[PDB]
Write a protein that binds this ligand. Structure first.
Ligand SMILES: NC(=O)C1=CN([C@@H]2O[C@H](COP(=O)(O)OP(=O)(O)OC[C@H]3O[C@@H](n4cnc5c(N)ncnc54)[C@H](O)[C@@H]3O)[C@@H](O)[C@H]2O)C=CC1
Ligand SMILES: NC(=O)C1=CN([C@@H]2O[C@H](COP(=O)(O)OP(=O)(O)OC[C@H]3O[C@@H](n4cnc5c(N)ncnc54)[C@H](O)[C@@H]3O)[C@@H](O)[C@H]2O)C=CC1
Ligand SMILES: NC(=O)C1=CN([C@@H]2O[C@H](COP(=O)(O)OP(=O)(O)OC[C@H]3O[C@@H](n4cnc5c(N)ncnc54)[C@H](O)[C@@H]3O)[C@@H](O)[C@H]2O)C=CC1
Lengths: 474, 474, 474, 474
């Protein structure tokens, strides 16, 4: 149980107000943790700023080596990290341990390698008698704001490319889920020079506002809700801060008549509900051609109904709780508002579970229409909707008439159709005949209200550099 | 006398309010032009949105061809274009014809070539049994907002990459300098399909606010002031619009003891006052090493005093007027504030010219200190200040202690020093033993409050695309 | 009608031996052209080496501009180039004019653009206190050897990236087909500085050998047979000359049971027999799944039998003659070899056309086995074989057990299978559900005995550069 | 000492003839090692080729992990590798351990990361209704030939990119210096799947020729002499094998009047004679402007003469022996022909050292002229020549009139000139005011008779891939 902030190479108790941290599987408080005070946010940013003079002139190879050691330390401590995440998030331990930990280590190893591989334009005399070259320099201090659904994983996605690029970082995890960030703080303390990495604790208003609005923070990076994104953008507009934003999605799952229906069902059973659907790429919005609609709904309803909820440290557990009491009510409301339309049918689920801890039933809803709030707004819970469609053109225009733009999939056995739909979809990512898969080499990020900017890949690193032109007269 | 807007392939009169356009050399009204109405702003964006369906799916080759045509049409009308810009802007005719026109033509020809040269990640199996590929797709409707200092040039810088990336465009020129834009509108009418290029006219509040606020606008690109920049980021925050920003600069000209002093004087006499200093890269704030400080002030004062003001259409004319009455007043005020410091000597200039038109005397200001407003804040007039400095480390630190980050130069004969200073400058571009030189291949753009995003280069193209990951299960 | 060599900016008669050039549709001599003498070969190389001192220091902009004006000139002379190519090669006029001319113009336009877009590595301090940058400089004099199948087109493929990169070029066309290249010589005389382009006439032994063996030639680029590839490689090994090689292919066309059979027939009818099959990507070797083999053989033999041979200048003509008397004998003996195998049935064709000029009948052969010479060796004629297969793995292993690696296609409606096979095929190109399509943006070039290096695309330009590291100590 | 071959996952004794390995400090025989037999060569290529089936389809993540593992194993055994290298090559122990070992480990760590960062072209529709993507797939079996100057390091330069690209490898070390190769074999046995790495022992003619001439080998990579290069090119010509060649250089050291003479002296003293000058980037050829010529020659002579020879395992030792008796015989004869020219003065050295072991005296030769053999031919021993020049243009022309193209440097304080001369030099790399410095991210490789292709950097990985165009019809 580690509870202190990391500021300028030191572990320090927050001197701000204490706040409760819950075990969502039971509703019990794990502990109370004191927030960073106004003075602590400011000290953190100042240390980062002072660390940048030397840190921002390091070589790729030195940064690469810091990142590989950070990778090793997380890997050697995988068990402890999974346990804290499962306790804090209610993730089934086996899921946290087997799926997330290996990914988090790999993010770090991949960004170590990428640090050393940055592209440019050929240097030469584009104007007679002058030599031009292009560099990628870092920006300075980055404010990173991580969400509650993948606490350590988001932390890794924000830290790794910022560091790789030669910036100093001030990280605020969600106040719901600080436990693994504060264990990382303890373990990562001496890997980077003092002030290069600072990790704080507390709420958006009390810690987040002073952080993101500091005159020395040159870039804010955020993964959370659109209203938060909107807020950070206006709040930092007076200093034209670089922003980097991932604000959720509402992935259409387009299933045509020639899809392997069993594979769709097997897929959605996992991708609709994994992490209780609190996932920015959740397979939550099915468009199913009218030919296969009834068969899909029946078979999906029956596969979803067998998802096993239980203790997170039980291996048989597939579906854990929601993140907080408030989130549970949020998800519950959305479903009741679906029900209230009169044409949406509950195929299975649609209830909070009995007990303490924040469990909602795995839910499937059918007969959802394009203009329904269930289709158009992100629910972020263990809830999947099904909408009938007639034809390719109509369903592509529906999928793309969305304010979201992060992820999507198409299920069809036809080569031509898969490539047509793929080319047209206005989403950061499109899977063909699967969903959900990410690799550290391939960029994750949105368009429209989903945001802009990439996590993972070389693009991810590029977002934390400024491209510069130096032209030398002969 | 071309006064009509281009909306959906048609030349139409503005149905909003009449406004005056002036000749800055004489102070006379050139004509009055009806602004675009609220309804016309909305029709333009609707046209571009509907045109995007087909235009976003065109090939690189087809967009390139359209862009070569556009280039052609500008070069065929270069003499006319240069005349309109001179009349509206007060630019010397020979300068607008011999410097601006070819560069404009070349911007379009460059971007035609780069539309076909877009980079990606090697397609392949990053996860066993799944082929990943990476795409660069267009955003939709771009709202482009251009300044009054380089009206046709900035229009090109905004039009060329956005079209090359596959977007549709709604362009608003400065209400002060619309004449080349409206001539472009007539000339380029049938080169792109209806709705792909739309050009309007009117002020920021009455036309720019409803344009950048349109729900169908996905990206807003602005060259203009910091205040305008902050306001647009605030205004479009609610829809997380991509923003692309170039908000000016204050280019440090760092001159060491071993510099070629006569080449510095020759350079600054051009690059300080070209365009009356209304240039986002003007050589406007000199740091001069103490060994050469007084000789430089001496020789620069004498060279700046000879700069010739006169009729724009006269080949001997070197310095034209400022853009408007209010911008003359702004510049004048700045100069007076420097005087009132008590420690700043006027070496030459520092008065408004008698006569009609908005002429300001070419001005050198000496004894400017680091913390003076004349050093920290962009004047955007024919005014340069000179500050003495001691040593390399001190001056780099002073130069980098700015809210601006666009352009800069270092003058020194030593290779080591030139590279050391160039590596450390926090500026989008640094020149060595010159200033001011731009080529279509090399990006131009800032950091800090100068903004982010590039114009020109492969990078300025990348800015109008979304990176997409498509992954196909085997 | 044009017969002079281009040497150092002058048009001059060969002083070597006269050689005959035939019209292959009639077997008549078009004219006799004197070869470059050994002195002229030396002289053209020394002119290119002399021109390289300035040409290799030109800006991308200037090279681009040369290339666009060359593109204009070809376009302007489209009709004439098509007639000469049709006369000298037997290509149906409509095809040379409508297919080849527009691609040739486009190649030069594409490379104009790509010349300004060359990639590199971010410049920076990879070693503390040292700034490294990466350049892409030209090699020098490039000897270019073109084949008889696509005379002007291959001339464009060799010239365009070599010039774009800043090399000087000494081109040798096939002695069988020099006519468009000599017209090129006249037309292009003055677009580049003297000696930057040189065009010669003559055979391999008398002209190629002295050219490719010249001490100042730094790179040889050849499209032609494996034996000429082998020979050039030996003959230039003494001076580690850079080689660039496209040596033919034997494209596997893989047809699965779920293919659109009618589309495969339509495709192979054009792509097996376009240019009388004298094409490096011809669809010449079908592997047909057991399920559809017999249907495919029946439908294909019926489609092949309608191919209309006749006067090249007739709009209805689809199949022109072979390139020479010797090539006709070669093709003929290949077909008699299959037949003598005792298990290959002639479905249609399989003879010489009556009359003069070098026409072979459009030919389909069925029952060819994996180890038959008809399957294994390039015939380069209007001849296509068909071989049954059982399963996917078997046939991918068959297709890959070849000495060729240039092009290939897979025909299947199944997305999974399309991507599996495409991933696995050991060929420079793989089309899915089509064949033969090329674009200037995408590379074309082989592996194994097909050679190495690309034509078209940014990669094609890269092949004519040396990457250089300049490291500057602080 | 370890003497066994690594073939297909097993350590086996050579079954060919026994060859002596020498300690070049003393002339003692270290041991005898049996060569691979022709059967063993064949068996190695066959194991690699069978290993490719699965190894060529691994993900970048997997290969990178094998590479990080191998880096870990070399690092963990750093002290032993350096001892073996020292005993084998006469390298001073402190030099091999402090300089060579860290750089070798880093090569592997670098390539591990680069394996996951491969660039491509943007996937999309370059031809309407067709989706194009670009991949980078492995070649299959690579034969790598390592030299005796940096045995382990060159084995890493060849192994790391070939493996990162997805190829299998059969490495032949120099028969002179196999000890670290065969220690690596032992230690690396189980890191890769069976047959993915194979390490043989033996001579160019008995093991080399059958290895590089094998039908399953698709690429040959050689670092060695020009003769050897020319021979590998002719010998593999019949199968058009990809070759990859680093064949030496003669690096010009260009020293202008404004150079820091003391820095030039301190530089060359190290870079002229490190590794007894048996380096392809040796600072061996000085061009010294007439103003500073006599001072440089005096001071250089005095620095060179203090170079301390002595036992390799002694900390004070700076200069070790040459690599063998024959190489010492060669070096001594190159110096004798320089003396017999009648115009070269021996400033210091110019003799074999008394004793056993192959020590030659650190040697400085003055008054050598542009056309002398000592200036035009690589010597590869502790020998440096000095040539007086008059002007910049003359010396750049002198430096570029070489059949070498690997490395070079320029020493001058002037920014203009350093850039002018760097841009013009026809050398794969140019240092400015230093020489010799290599880093993993930056390519090393030549042009002209120094060969082509690159070691280290992303370029060096690209050299072991085939770019492929996959195009899917809609
Ligand atoms: N990755 C995620 O956690 C995502 C969450 N959402 C949605 O957010 C909705 C409602 O609020 P929450 O969900 O609790 O997420 P949120 O946006 O409120 O929280 C994400 C992060 O932003 C921080 N934050 C909030 N205000 C801030 C401020 N003024 N300055 C700086 N940082 C600030 C939070 O403390 C937290 O670390 C939920 O429906 C959830 O689905 C949507 C997309 C992604
Ligand atoms: N190009 C640059 O980087 C420039 C920096 N500046 C600085 O700022 C001053 C510029 O003069 P101004 O005309 O006042 O403003 P502005 O310089 O920012 O004009 C730029 C463009 O933005 C538009 N604009 C203004 N308000 C808008 C709104 N609410 N919504 C949409 N578009 C809007 C204008 O109509 C014009 O087309 C100068 O003193 C100079 O110091 C000025 C001009 C250019
Ligand atoms: N003077 C003569 O009697 C010659 C006879 N041959 C023989 O005749 C046939 C030639 O037919 P193609 O199919 O045109 O050969 P090819 O098909 O590979 O022709 C491709 C191009 O390579 C050129 N080339 C051929 N040998 C060369 C060499 N040694 N050095 C530089 N360039 C060279 C050709 O002139 C042509 O431009 C072959 O069967 C070959 O054995 C080849 C060259 C000369």
């Amino acid at each position: 149980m580690q509870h202190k902030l990391l500021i300028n190479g030191e572990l320090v108790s927050g001197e701000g107000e204490k706040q409760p941290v819950y075990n969502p599987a039971t509703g019990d408080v794990l502990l109370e943790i004191a927030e960073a005070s106004a003075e602590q946010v400011d000290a953190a940013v100042r240390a980062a700023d002072a660390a940048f003079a030397e840190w921002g002139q390091t070589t790729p190879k030195v940064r690469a080596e810091c990142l590989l050691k950070l990778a090793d330390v997380i890997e050697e401590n995988g068990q402890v990290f999974a346990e804290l995440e499962s306790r804090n998030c209610g993730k089934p331990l086996h899921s946290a341990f087997n799926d997330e930990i290996p990914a988090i280590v790999d993010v770090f190893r991949f960004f170590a390698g990428a640090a050393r591989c940055l592209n440019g334009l050929a240097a030469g005399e584009y104007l007679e008698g002058h030599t031009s070259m292009i560099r990628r320099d870092p920006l300075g201090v980055v404010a990173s704001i991580a969400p509650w659904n993948y606490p350590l994983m988001m932390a890794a996605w924000k830290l790794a490319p910022a560091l790789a690029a030669g910036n100093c970082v001030v990280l605020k995890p969600s106040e719901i889920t600080p436990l693994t960030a504060l264990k990382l703080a303890e373990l990562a303390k001496d890997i980077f020079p003092a002030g290069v990495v600072n990790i704080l604790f507390g709420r958006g208003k009390t810690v987040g506002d002073p952080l993101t609005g500091h005159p020395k923070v040159r870039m804010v990076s955020l993964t959370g809700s659109i209203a938060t994104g909107e807020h950070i953008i206006s709040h930092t507009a007076s200093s034209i801060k670089r922003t980097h934003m991932e604000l959720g999605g509402k992935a259409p799952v387009i299933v045509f008549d020639d899809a392997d229906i069993e594979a769709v069902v097997e897929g959605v059973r996992t991708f609709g509900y994994y992490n209780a659907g609190q996932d920015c790429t959740a397979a939550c919005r099915i468009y199913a051609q009218k030919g296969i609609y009834d068969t899909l709904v029946e078979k999906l309803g029956a596969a979803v109904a067998t998802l096993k909820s239980g203790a997170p440290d039980d291996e048989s557990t597939e579906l854990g709780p929601l993140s907080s009491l408030a989130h549970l009510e949020r998800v519950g409301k959305a479903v009741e508002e679906a029900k209230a339309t009169g044409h949406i049918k509950v195929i299975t689920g649609g209830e909070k579970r009995k007990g303490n801890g924040y469990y909602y039933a795995p839910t499937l809803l059918a007969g959802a229409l394009q203009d329904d709030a269930i289709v158009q707004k992100e629910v972020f819970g263990p809830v999947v909707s099904v909408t009938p469609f007639d034809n390719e053109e109509q369903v592509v225009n529906w999928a793309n008439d969305s304010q979201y733009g992060l992820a999507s999939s198409v299920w069809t056995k036809d080569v031509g159709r898969a490539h047509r739909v793929s080319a047209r979809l206005q989403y950061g990512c499109t899977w063909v005949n699967t969903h959900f898969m990410l690799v550290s080499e391939m960029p994750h990020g949105g368009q429209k209200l989903s945001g802009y900017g990439k996590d993972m890949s070389l693009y991810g690193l590029e977002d934390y550099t400024v491209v510069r032109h130096v032209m030398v007269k002969h």
